[PDB]
Structure 1
Amino acid sequence: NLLQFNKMIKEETGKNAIPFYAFYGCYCGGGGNGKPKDGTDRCCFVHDCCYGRLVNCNTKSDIYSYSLKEGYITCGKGTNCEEQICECDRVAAECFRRNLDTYNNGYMFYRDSKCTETSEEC
């Protein structure tokens, strides 16, 4: 579920999905395309790529079991889809945390028209 991933994003970055990630560079938020704007944007790109591999799962709705001991995100048991989605989510949540040092405010709400590049392959 997007609310869980959004939870992780906050638990890892101390920031909030919306706005900080709702729309960033060209991949955060609603799909997107072109070429990643930067580290953080690269994270959303990969995440978008992750969900894609799971064509048969309501990546945004399906709720999954996960924990959070000492900042380490655990994915409980569930269904291929629930487990998979969890696994896409935490790698991102962590990816964002690993890029905090170069987050660019200017890329927040970065227009997708400016994303005039050859879409990166997954």
Structure 2
Amino acid sequence: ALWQFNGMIKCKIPSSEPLLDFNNYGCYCGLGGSGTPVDDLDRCCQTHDNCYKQAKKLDSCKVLVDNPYTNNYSYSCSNNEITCSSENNACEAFICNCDRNAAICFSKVPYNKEHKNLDKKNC
């Protein structure tokens, strides 16, 4: 869900307030996402959006009537490393991996503040 994802982002980027820094960034970071990503951070968000699309197609998630946005997976953060819980079921695990991949991606790309709060006509 959002609470775990936000915690993962802070795990990798301890200086960030994700719900303020990454939301409404570029064409993909935040609600919806379409068009050409504007930079590598936006591509991280595009990948993440696509990972959620795939989670919704996974048989485990469908049978569990899962919503990736509300998934109740478990994770831990130690020394700025994210570990998705081994106890997560297949659906939970998939979504945890989407979130972990994105948090890692965000930590590895530049932040271009000219893309914060981008007008979606640019998308």
Task: Show the counterpart of 2:25.
Answer: 24
Can you list the C-alpha shifts for 1:16-41, whole angstroms capped at 9, x where unaligned? 12221111110001121001110111
The residue aligned with 2:4 is 4
1:1-122 equivalence runs, <5 A: 1-13=1-13, 14-55=15-56, 56=62, 57-76=66-85, 77-99=87-109, 102-115=110-123
From the two aligned structures, give the one with the greater helix fraction: 2
Instruction: Give the TM-score normalised by structure 1.
Output: 0.87
Gaps of 5+ in 1: 116-122
Aligned residues with identical type, % of pairs:
42
Gaps of 5+ in 2: 57-61
Instruction: Give runs of ≥4 in structure 1 deviating > 2 Å.
Output: none
- Which of 45-54 and 7-16 deviates more? 7-16
* Aligned 8 A contact 1:19 1:108 in 2: no
Structure 2 length normalisation: TM-score?
A: 0.86
Q: How many aligned positions are there?
A: 113
- Tell me the C-alpha RMSD between the 2 structures: 1.1
Which residue number in structure 2 is paired with residue 118 of structure 1? none
TM-superposed CA distance for 1:68, in Å, is 1.3
Comparing both structures, which one devotes a greater share of its residues to strand? 2
The aligned amino acid for 2:77 is: L
